[PDB]
């Protein structure tokens, strides 16, 4: 919530995962999430309604994207987290 | 041995087609099969029991739902709840798997029917105990099945899990068989003066059908040097390998060689192998329109026909499709009956056995020729290779080591 | 071990039929064949290979490609042989989809089917495919009735868990009355399997139940089911084959023994061969471009058998062409 970055599932584990979610600081409505997916988390953001932990944007990765930066659709993650880190 | 190298130096390699995953036990594949989704596509459990958030002691208070066989959309934000996962089911919002309720001291106030309140499991487990993560077996993009191989029985199962119904494999040859000699009648008729029924057609056709290749039967063509041209011309049109039995052993009137040479204009690579009485072994190739075709001319004795068409004919149709190392398998066994040694070497058809006491298998001869008064119930399962006569060594006793071939299931 | 004894002591033997010689590869014989005319019927002696009115091949010996040769030399076009079984296979589990379909939440693809069918269809027997059957008791009842109404042996894969509310055991002793012989046999606790016998106004029928793990399914089929269809054919000895070999690599062992898939090789320099394992459940193997030929039997983890080396000699069961 407080720190920016991404919000990942609990029992998933590190690996390649798709990107479908954007988050706004002052917009609570969000769509549902499915296993093997992540949500882009900005500083001071609501819970994405289906996550349990938030990973730092530093411990991330990039993938090939569109010519006009139209999303990457892949993030990947590095280390294993613990369910519940932000209130 | 020069025949074997020559045989595997002119046979081409066929094209490719597209087939379903049901048919295709044995075909070698030509493309590369890639995965499209993970396996499993969601975290699951291996045991059945309770799923509890980590960083907790023996303190739990409530159970909300339980497993099933879909995706369960329910979880409270509180950290003192349990979900009771079964043998195979997603893990909703936790990190610790089945706590082995059958092993720990569990159960609480519960309900009159089928419900529970709490567990209070004293033991604690590491974060991640029995969960199977996403991709523990197959990743999103991976080679799984490579080009080459042979498409065994368990290989079709791997194709189903990935989800590729259509593949690209090599084709099978079409083989046609004909028999020669103007002294043979079909084995469905009463005998006439001075004639013998022909058996080489049936024995050969039942040998190239065990592997699975399609077959076409031509008939019995006369030994005249005229009707052979009218017969081989039909065979060369609707097939790729034509096999002829007997003949050749005439010399002055060896019509088969004449018909092949001054007519179809086909190359004759070799005309005889170094063997004791029994000449006919002719390899030929013909090139029409660009697709090369193979012809053979097997000997006439009923016992030498199987040996010839299992030593350098059977290991030549295999290279035609996809096999990387087409070579017959030679094992080592022991003898169980004294056999005489003639000067030039021969080949005996035998039967193998396996006793669970001593390593090497045991071999029993089943008659060099004639083949009457069959003993034992099991059918022949290979050929036996013998050495030629050498001074004092003119007789082989029981035991020792001999070289045995494999021609069928064992 | 006692599991194998029970299966061979309750499987029946089918009848007989008349067929042609051409379509007769792999069938055991019922009658006896006698010569009709001497061979050769003229001096080359008058009769040197076959004497007239002498037994050629006996009753109850397996027919091979070489033995079909004699059947045409004498002239007996038609013989009497035992009949082949009909096997129908079904797969349970409410988490399965046909392999020719996309992915929905929490669903995987059928794998044990199309693996059992291919293995049986390799030996020569016909088959009938049923589909995926749910765990509703009404649905399970309908599926089994069709199976016993068009075939003789029924093989079911999956749905052996939930022993408290096992639906398979319920329909086998309430609706369709039948006797269950064994339900969990593996020496020390192993994967479940059930053998059942049902008899209805005549011929007996056998119904099988096999686990859901894709690696242990093939071990069960080639050790119990395969050496039981062959007795129905008429083969005198339906035992499998065991040979001795060395090890291609050194592998760790675990308390309870398990079975692995191995590829058999041979060399021209040493007598005994050695085999290389491929693992129970892994991401296949980039190398070893050959299909499996046997099943390695790892011994139980003893003090001396904590682990094995490349020089140890083991046993293996041939399950394919070598």
- H helices present in chain C, as ranges: 2-8, 67-73, 116-123, 137-150, 167-171, 214-220, 226-233
Mutate to test the interface with C, among B47, B85, B153, B191 (most CBs of C within 10 A): B153
Helix, strand or coil, per DSSP, at residue C227:
helix
- Single out the residue of A36, B25, B39, B127 nearest to residue C281, CA to CA: B39
Which chain A residues have a beta carbon less than 8 Å from that of B93?
10, 52, 83
CB–CB of C73 and B356 under 8 A?
A: no
CA B266 distance to own-chain centroid: 33
Q: How far is CA C125 from CA B9, B410, C118, C120, C233, in A?
A: 38, 19, 10, 6, 10
Q: How far is CA B404 from CA B284, B332, B350, in A?
A: 29, 6, 9
How do beta strands A5-8 and A37-41 pair?
antiparallel
Task: Nearest chain B residue to C219 by CA: give it.
Answer: B154
Q: Are A40 and A25 in contact (CB under 8 A)?
A: no
As given in the structure block, the two tokens for residue C118 are 């291919």
CB–CB of B127 and A82 under 8 A?
A: yes
- Single out the residue of B222, B288, B312 nearest to residue B259, CA to CA: B222
As given in the structure block, the two tokens for residue B305 are 């026909």
CB–CB of B41 and C70 under 8 A?
A: no
Beta bridge partners of B168: B18
- C window 135-154, beta carbon within 8 A of B: none
Which chain C residues have a beta carbon less than 8 Å from that of B142?
283
Tell me the angle at which helices C226-233 and C116-123 cross, rounded to the nearest 10 degrees.
30
Q: Go through the domains of chain C in sequence order and give each one's CATH number.
A: 2-10+84-233 (3.40.980.10), 22-76 (3.90.105.10), 241-322 (2.40.340.10)
Nearest to A83 among B38, B53, B131 (CB): B53
Helix, strand or coil, per DSSP, at residue A23:
coil
Phi, psi of B272 (to 5 degrees): -165, 140
- Single out the residue of A44, A7, A48, A54 nearest to residue A30, CA to CA: A48
As given in the structure block, the two tokens for residue B58 are 């023996």
CA A14 distance to own-chain centroid: 13
As given in the structure block, the two tokens for residue B368 are 């060099």
The breaks in chain A (C to N more than 2.5 Å) occur after: none
Q: How far is CA C290 from CA B149, B315, B323, C265, in A?
A: 5, 17, 10, 10
Mutate to test the interface with B, among C118, C261, C288, C293 (most CBs of B within 10 A): C118
CB–CB of B41 and C108 under 8 A?
A: yes
* Torsion of Cα atoms, C169 then C174 then C179 then C180, to 10°: 10
CB–CB of C291 and B155 under 8 A?
A: yes
Residues shown for chain A: 87
Q: What is the 3-state secondary structure (H, E, C) of chain B?
A: CHHHHHHCCCCCCCCEEEECCCCCCCCCECCCECCCCCECCCCECCCCCCCECCCCCCCCCEECCCCCCCCCCCCCCCCCEECCCCCCCECCCCCECCCCCCCCCCCCCCCCCCCCCCCCCCCCCCCCCCCECCCCCECCCCCCECCECCCCHHHHHHHHHHCCCCEEEECCCCEEEEEECCCEECCCCCCCCCCEECCHHHHHHCCHHHHCCCEEEEEEECCCCCHHHHHHHHHCCCCCEEEEECCCCCCCCCHHHHHHHHHHCCEEEEEECCCCCCCEEEEEEEEECCEEEEEEEECCCHHHHHHHCCCCCHHHHHHHHCCCCCCCCEEEEEECCCEECCCCCCEEEEEEECCCCCCCCEEEECCCCCCCCCCCCCCCCCEEECCCCECCECEECCEEEEEEECCCCC
Give the whole-angstrom CA distance, residue B374 versus residue C56: 7
**At how many Å resolution was this determined?**
3.6
Would you call C15 an interface residue with chain B, using a CB distance cutoff of 8 Å?
A: no
As given in the structure block, the two tokens for residue C32 are 């006896």
Which chain A residues have a beta carbon less than 8 Å from that of B46?
none
Task: Nearest chain A residue to B45 by CA: give it.
Answer: A11
CB–CB of B133 and A16 under 8 A?
A: no
Task: Nearest chain B residue to C107 by CA: give it.
Answer: B70
Would you call B386 an interface residue with chain A, using a CB distance cutoff of 8 Å?
A: no
Which chain C residues have a beta carbon less than 8 Å from that of B349?
66
Helix, strand or coil, per DSSP, at residue C7:
helix
CB–CB of A82 and B95 under 8 A?
A: yes
Question: How was it solved?
Answer: cryo-EM
Would you call A44 an interface residue with chain B, using a CB distance cutoff of 8 Å?
A: no
Contacting subunits of A (3+ beta carbon pairs below 8 A): B
Would you call C63 an interface residue with chain B, using a CB distance cutoff of 8 Å?
A: yes
Tokens 């299992």 belong to B310
CA B292 distance to own-chain centroid: 26
Q: Are C67 and C57 in contact (CB under 8 A)?
A: yes
* Torsion of Cα atoms, C114 then C120 then C121 then C126, to 10°: -110
Q: How far is CA C24 from CA B75, C76, C89, C236, in A?
A: 65, 13, 26, 18
Element (H, E) at C21: none
Residues shown for chain B: 410
How far the first Cα of chain A sits from its last, in Å, is 7
CB–CB of A83 and B91 under 8 A?
A: no
Tokens 């004294």 belong to B338
CA C74 distance to own-chain centroid: 35
CB–CB of B94 and A83 under 8 A?
A: yes
């Amino acid at each position: 919530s407080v720190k920016d970055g991404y919000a990942v599932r609990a029992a998933d584990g590190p690996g390649d995962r798709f990107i479908i979610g954007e988050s706004q600081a002052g917009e609570q409505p969000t769509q549902t999430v499915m296993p093997g997916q992540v949500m882009r988390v900005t500083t001071g953001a609501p819970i994405p309604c289906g996550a349990d932990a938030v990973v730092q944007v530093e411990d991330t990765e990039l993938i090939r994207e569109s010519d006009d930066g139209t999303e990457e659709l892949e993030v990947r993650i590095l280390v294993q987290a613990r369910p519940g880190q932000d209130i």
